Every structure is written in structure tokens, then in C-alpha cells.
Design a binder for this molecule. Sequence first.
Ligand SMILES: Cc1nc(C(=O)N2CCCC2)c(C)s1
Length: 284
Amino acid sequence: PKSMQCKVILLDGSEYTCDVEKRSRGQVLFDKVCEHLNLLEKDYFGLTYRDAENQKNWLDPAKEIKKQVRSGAWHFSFNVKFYPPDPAQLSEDITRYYLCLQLRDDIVSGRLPCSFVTLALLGSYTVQSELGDYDPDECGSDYISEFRFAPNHTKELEDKVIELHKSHRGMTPAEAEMHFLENAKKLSMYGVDLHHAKDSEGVEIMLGVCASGLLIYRDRLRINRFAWPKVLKISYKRNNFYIKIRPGEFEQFESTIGFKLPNHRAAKRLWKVCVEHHTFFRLL
Ligand SMILES: Cc1nc(C(=O)N2CCCC2)c(C)s1
């Protein structure tokens, strides 16, 4: 039985290495990573890989790994796939912990925009969880944390993290992580997967996929929002992505909205993430 080496980047930035039989389905590798992580609430997570166009793709757990990575390296990341709208309802603290690690990367990367005060508050909960109670011995007037808190760090932001960290004395790691999540979950881009597209007129938009539905960001004025229950059919054809919006009360016909994606693979990827979100968030 021939086995392929897999390398998985974990949410703490470390690398997990294991072997699977070369015809293994994605679920096999995912089960190994999740056991390594002592993770039981596995439904929120998945593995990504980079395709031959260098795009992030979800590893389909039901399909052979080799028919997805194809010509590419067996290199993956472990990621949150479905961001829980109410992290307090997850059954395990360790689930909330991995969700915090993902969100920290969402913030530092700039995928999850955040005000100065919310960056400092989230940072303060991370420090409380990671180091425990504020200690002045590890912080003079010139302190800069090893923790990455933001896409761009300033001395002012470092100072505000410490000031709020001082307020959290006696907070336990699970408590600080829950506070982190209670704040993060409110951010307007929380759990929004953004896809570049053009509308039916050729105007550049972003489509966001999340728990509450599909978001169509045209400009700062008028953001179109469509709740999953308002969506009956999601389809792609060539470079095109279509959603079938259900008839409003007393309307005779479903309405169709068309988008142009960069290429056929980008349209299929958007279709699959929409179908998966619709199914997942239909059951929650
Ligand atoms: C507040 C918003 N930001 C974006 C955006 O283009 N983003 C790219 C990085 C994450 C956000 C929208 C589409 S709405």
C-alpha cells in the first residue's frame, strides 16, 4: 500500500506531517488532523489547498485527495470553513480556541476589517488567554507584544492592548476566548468569504458568502443582501454564476441575477461554497 506524505499548516502556524494511502479521500487526512488537534466539533472546519492557479480551494472530504491537488504538492492548511454565528453555543472550549486562532489570522491578514478599539480589545483578550494576568515586569512604557494583533501595528495600538489587558485580571483562558468571540462575531465581515465578480453590466463587485446568506457589495452605498431562504437554486455555466431568488408574495415568477467570474474554476468554486453554506446554515 503506497502512502503520500501530507503537510498541514495548523492555525498556530506549526506544521503537522502525516501519511495517507495515495488514493485516500480528503476525510481520511482531515480525521488525522482533527485527532492530532483533539477536535470533536469538526463540522465547522476543513482543509484548504492551493490549485494550479494558486487559488485557495476547500479539500472535498468525499473525493480522492489526488484528484483535487492533481499536479500540486500535498500541502494543506487547517481552517474554519463555517463560522458559527453564536460561538457561545459550541459544546467545547477547544472548538472556540481554534475559532479564535482562525479569527486572529483573519484580522492580521486584513480579511476581517476592525476598528482601532476592537483591534485593541480582541488583542487584550488574546494576551489574557495566552499570558494570563497583566504583569508590569514584562512591559515598560516601550512594550511591543510578540502577538500580531492587526494588519498594521502602531505604538498607540500596543498601549491600548496593555490598558485593556490590565482590566481583565483573574480572567481564565476559556473566559477571555469567549469574550474575544462575543466581540469578533459582531464585525460586519465576520465569516464572510469574499469573491471578485462583475454584475450583468460589467461593473466590478464582491460577492460575500456567510451564514446569513449571499451579500452583493456594489459600493459603500446600497449593499444588496439575500438570506439563504430567499435562494432556491445556485448554478454556474462557463464563467457565469446565477442565483434563483424566490418570488416575493403575490409575484408570479422567480427572479434571476447573473454574475461574471474571472474564469470557469472561480465560478464553480463560488457555486460549491454557496451550496455548502446554504446546506450547513439551513440545518443550524
Ligand atoms: C468593509 C468591506 N471590505 C470589503 C473588501 O473589499 N475587503 C477586502 C479585504 C476584506 C474586506 C468589502 C467588499 S466590504
